[PDB]
Amino acid sequence: PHMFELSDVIEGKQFDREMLSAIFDVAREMEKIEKSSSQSEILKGYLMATLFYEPSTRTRLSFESAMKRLGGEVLTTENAREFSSAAKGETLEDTIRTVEGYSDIIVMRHFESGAARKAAATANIPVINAGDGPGEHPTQALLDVYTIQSEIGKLDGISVALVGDLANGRTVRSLAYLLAKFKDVKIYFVSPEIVKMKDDIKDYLTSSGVEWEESSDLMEVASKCDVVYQTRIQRERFGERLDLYEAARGKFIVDKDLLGVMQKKAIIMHPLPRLDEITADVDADPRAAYFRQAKNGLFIRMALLKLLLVGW
Amino acid sequence: HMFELSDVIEGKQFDREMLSAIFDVAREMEKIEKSSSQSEILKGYLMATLFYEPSTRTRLSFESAMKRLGGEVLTTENAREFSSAAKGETLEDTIRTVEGYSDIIVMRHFESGAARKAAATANIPVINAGDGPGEHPTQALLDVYTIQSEIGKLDGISVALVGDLANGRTVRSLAYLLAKFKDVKIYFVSPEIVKMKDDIKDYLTSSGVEWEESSDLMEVASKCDVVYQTRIQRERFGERLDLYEAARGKFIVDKDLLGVMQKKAIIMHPLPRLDEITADVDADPRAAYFRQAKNGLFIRMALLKLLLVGW
Amino acid sequence: HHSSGLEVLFQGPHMFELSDVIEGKQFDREMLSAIFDVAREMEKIEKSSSQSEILKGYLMATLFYEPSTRTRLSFESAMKRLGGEVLTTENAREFSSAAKGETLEDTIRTVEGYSDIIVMRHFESGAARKAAATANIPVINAGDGPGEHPTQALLDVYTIQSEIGKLDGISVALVGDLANGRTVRSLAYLLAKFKDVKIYFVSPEIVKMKDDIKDYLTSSGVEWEESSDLMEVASKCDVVYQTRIQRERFGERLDLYEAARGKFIVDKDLLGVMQKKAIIMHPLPRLDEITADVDADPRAAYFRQAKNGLFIRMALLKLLLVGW
Numbered sequence: 013p014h015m016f017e018l019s020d021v022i023e024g025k026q027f028d029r030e031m032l033s034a035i036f037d038v039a040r041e042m043e044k045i046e047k048s049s050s051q052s053e054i055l056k057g058y059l060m061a062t063l064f065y066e067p068s069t070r071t072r073l074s075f076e077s078a079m080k081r082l083g084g085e086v087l088t089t090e091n092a093r094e095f096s097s098a099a100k101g102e103t104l105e106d107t108i109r110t111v112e113g114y115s116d117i118i119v120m121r122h123f124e125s126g127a128a129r130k131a132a133a134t135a136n137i138p139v140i141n142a143g144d145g146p147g148e149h150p151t152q153a154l155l156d157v158y159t160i161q162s163e164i165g166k167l168d169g170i171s172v173a174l175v176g177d178l179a180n181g182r183t184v185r186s187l188a189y190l191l192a193k194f195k196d197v198k199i200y201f202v203s204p205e206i207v208k209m210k211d212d213i214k215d216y217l218t219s220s221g222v223e224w225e226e227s228s229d230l231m232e233v234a235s236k237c238d239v240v241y242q243t244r245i246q247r248e249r250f251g252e253r254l255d256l257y258e259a260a261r262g263k264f265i266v267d268k269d270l271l272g273v274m275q276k277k278a279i280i281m282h283p284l285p286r287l288d289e290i291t292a293d294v295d296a297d298p299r300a301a302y303f304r305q306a307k308n309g310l311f312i313r314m315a316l317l318k319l320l321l322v323g324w
Numbered sequence: 325h326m327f328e329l330s331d332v333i334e335g336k337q338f339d340r341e342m343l344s345a346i347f348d349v350a351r352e353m354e355k356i357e358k359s360s361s362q363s364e365i366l367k368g369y370l371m372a373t374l375f376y377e378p379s380t381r382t383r384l385s386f387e388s389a390m391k392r393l394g395g396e397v398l399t400t401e402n403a404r405e406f407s408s409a410a411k412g413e414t415l416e417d418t419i420r421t422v423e424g425y426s427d428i429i430v431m432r433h434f435e436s437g438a439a440r441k442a443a444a445t446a447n448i449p450v451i452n453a454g455d456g457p458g459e460h461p462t463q464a465l466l467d468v469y470t471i472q473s474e475i476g477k478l479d480g481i482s483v484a485l486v487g488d489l490a491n492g493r494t495v496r497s498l499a500y501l502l503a504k505f506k507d508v509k510i511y512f513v514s515p516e517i518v519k520m521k522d523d524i525k526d527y528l529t530s531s532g533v534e535w536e537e538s539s540d541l542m543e544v545a546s547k548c549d550v551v552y553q554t555r556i557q558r559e560r561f562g563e564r565l566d567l568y569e570a571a572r573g574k575f576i577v578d579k580d581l582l583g584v585m586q587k588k589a590i591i592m593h594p595l596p597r598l599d600e601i602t603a604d605v606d607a608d609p610r611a612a613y614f615r616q617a618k619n620g621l622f623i624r625m626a627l628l629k630l631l632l633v634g635w
Numbered sequence: 636h637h638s639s640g641l642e643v644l645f646q647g648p649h650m651f652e653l654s655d656v657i658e659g660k661q662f663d664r665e666m667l668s669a670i671f672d673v674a675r676e677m678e679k680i681e682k683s684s685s686q687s688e689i690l691k692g693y694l695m696a697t698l699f700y701e702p703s704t705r706t707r708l709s710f711e712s713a714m715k716r717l718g719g720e721v722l723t724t725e726n727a728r729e730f731s732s733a734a735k736g737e738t739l740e741d742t743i744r745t746v747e748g749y750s751d752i753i754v755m756r757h758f759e760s761g762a763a764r765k766a767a768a769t770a771n772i773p774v775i776n777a778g779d780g781p782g783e784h785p786t787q788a789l790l791d792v793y794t795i796q797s798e799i800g801k802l803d804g805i806s807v808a809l810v811g812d813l814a815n816g817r818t819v820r821s822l823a824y825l826l827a828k829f830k831d832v833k834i835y836f837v838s839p840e841i842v843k844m845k846d847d848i849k850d851y852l853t854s855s856g857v858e859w860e861e862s863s864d865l866m867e868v869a870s871k872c873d874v875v876y877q878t879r880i881q882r883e884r885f886g887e888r889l890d891l892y893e894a895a896r897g898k899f900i901v902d903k904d905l906l907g908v909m910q911k912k913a914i915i916m917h918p919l920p921r922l923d924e925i926t927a928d929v930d931a932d933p934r935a936a937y938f939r940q941a942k943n944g945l946f947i948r949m950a951l952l953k954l955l956l957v958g959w
Contacts, residue, residue, distance in 0.1 A: 049368070050368065051367055051368035056686050057684065057685065057686040059712060059715060059716070061708065064406070067405070067406050067407060067408060067410045067411070068406075068407075068408060069400070069407045069408035069409065069413065069418065069421055069422070070408065070421055073372065073398050073400070073421075073422060073425045073426075074424075074425055076398050076425075077370060077398055077425035077426065080370060080396045080398070081370070085715045087708050087711050087712055087715070088399070088723070089704070089708070090406045091405070091406055091726075094702070094726065095699070095702055095703075095725040095726055096702060096703075096704045097702055097703060097704035097705065097919070097920045098704070099702045100702065100920050101920070101922050102704065102919075102920035102921075105927075106919065106920060106921065107704060109930075109938045109941075110704055110705055110708075110919065110938065110941050111704070111708060113709070113938065113941050113942035113944075113945060114708045114709055114711075114712035114945055115708075115712065284408070284413070284417065284421065285408045285411050285412070285413035285417060286413075286417065287412055292416075295420075303420045303421070303424065306421050306424055307424035307425075309424075310424060310425055360692065361692065362691050362692035375730075378729070378730055378731060378732060378734045378735065379731075379732065380724070380731045380732035380733070380737070380742065380745060380746070381732065381745055384696065384722050384724070384745075384746060384749045384750075385748075385749055387722050387749075388694060388722055388749035388750065391694060391720045391722070392694070399723070401730045402729070402730060595732070595737070595741065595745065596732045596735050596736065596737035596741060597737075597741065598736055603738075603740075606744075614744045614745065614748065617744075617745050617748050618748030618749075620748075621748060621749055
């Protein structure tokens, strides 16, 4: 019995290997609570205020479900830009000092990088970053690592393929950041050259002693990975280079043929939403883990709510 | 025992025995709502709403229903704007995502056919809250329940369906369920150009339901247990503004219409109304449309109860 | 047990009528004393670890036709802190069937079938009274478009009593757009129910307080003074109650705009001339009319004011639904 060492959940760098492992154990105890017939009272009497400045399905509803499955209540604000007094020019710091009067924990998806950290510094209650505009989405990174552990049974000694828009991809960057905390990890960067991973993550993995390789050949890489983590490449990333778009057409898709070359114990992940970059006929394969991944978000967010409000 | 329906999607799922049994559950839900004790029947269950179109009655009655039973609700309104359906996510993906967080899904989509796709996809129950311009089965249930409740029986009744019959999803759906009862008579009251389509006419004929068409709401209304009013949108007359003008003032529920009605008849309207029912009708005890909305709460309590914990 | 120093001689219900919360003139001294006493009991419930069940089994319906942060969330928090439930409707203009032309009376007679209390912020003055007259359940006015915001008036007076320790004998500066200031007019109205109150109207002449409120204060024997000099007035006030002046109010008179520039701002210079036991209030939201560096001063009471809104709204919910 003791206080959680984090006062807020804002950024990947707040987490070390031991913290990640301990949180993942709590997520397994939350999975047992969620499966139970009887209503948990762990967070009875606690109120969570949401502040969604951008749209969300998975993050907004998993946090609300997590709070209610633990017996807590929720005060929602979506389109804090239309329906909140943030539509009358109110600063973030004012919104936070107002809303903490009514609540015990704040969950915020802002439109501007740095918003979540300013919120945490201003508030005298815990803040969770639910996505920080072009910034960090740390509970996405936590549930992604948890899903790998849950599906593969290990984080040490794995090969992970990060596919799609790696240059501008916040989830692939954050997943690489956290995976670098385990041993004997290999990461494959699979992308068109035009959206390859930025030097900052490459140099970070090297300095962490994580082996990495760059490829434009998903079929080859997929055959020797434990995990294929898929993300969208937006057409607009090719700018006027429609020659380069044509060359990438059909080369970074998860389809039945790609599952054909993958190992029987490997998995397909996607933070979601997806468009055509994973074909609907892949969903029937037991190795398609993206819906299980979204459900693990419920257990990870239950664990963080429980830890921030009542401790270990 | 287990409810015989896995989902509530379309009126054709219902036989008259199932309707009568649901109405008995709705009366048990009315006693629960009236009690001063918080029900715990649905304690621990979570309902996710998905509203892709605006709603007052349907949205708030489902949420009230769940909470009056001690359940909780995860709401999504304008799933077009504030959901990740605002970034092109397919219905099947939304449903497989949302079912990870909830025990029952209530959905008002913008496209006919969405609710049955959601039911087929989900491993939890789905209730159709309005399938865009298609099935709105809980409206049809609360409509038939309101008639049973106000009139005291469904066999042997006389119902006027008034307004846009050609295009009227709600009046067509109410005709579909009333024809499961015996010795029913239906009056179709409308401008001739928006008369009831031939499919519903043949359906009533085959069902052994007597029907009559009329443009004379004063003569019909004197002979009916129920006047079920709906609005005729100007759009339905298209370029026929002459037929619009000829209908003006002729399909209104007002004090003069109530004056020719039997003392135990009722006015119903799915709502919202504009001027097709005058405000001064509201004070008449026969004005049943606010009681009808409240009956939605008891019907929706009954369906949530039945789908989640059974009879 | 009387906040006025004397012992409470009788235990039992009060003598007032309270079935809706619509307008300031409902709030006689007996009712203000009761609401403030219940608000102090709610501060203890809110502090406590155990979940209150005072309003278990009650359902609130909200109808917000205008944007809100403090009023919408404080009502919902208030209901849930007392173990009640909430059915929300924000954007009742876009996401409700009032997007399809429905009358307010039809909305109220619909929603009352699903709920035990309605909290409404409409866009038209007079909506809250029409909703109360229509409904057979309690209605609370959460802001009646350009009309009254009575729960703000309540929490403002309660905040003054809490921060200063009295209402009789205080000096209050009402600052900003007084001519069109819903909250300053309602605050002036409730303060006139107490003894030896002094009010300072601080503003540009162009947005000075209307004669109806001046005449009311004169009739009620409340001393008042007009000023365009916030630095002079702030030094002799218990309370500086700040509000925004919209540039739009100067019309074509940009000479008058220029002349008011930086004259009606609460900043560290103004705090400098203020008494140690004085306070800054603002109903919120603010923009530039209170500088961020004022927030660290312990006299900056506008976030404590907003919190007091929770305790007031908990008190009203209890008084309306379960009574004495």
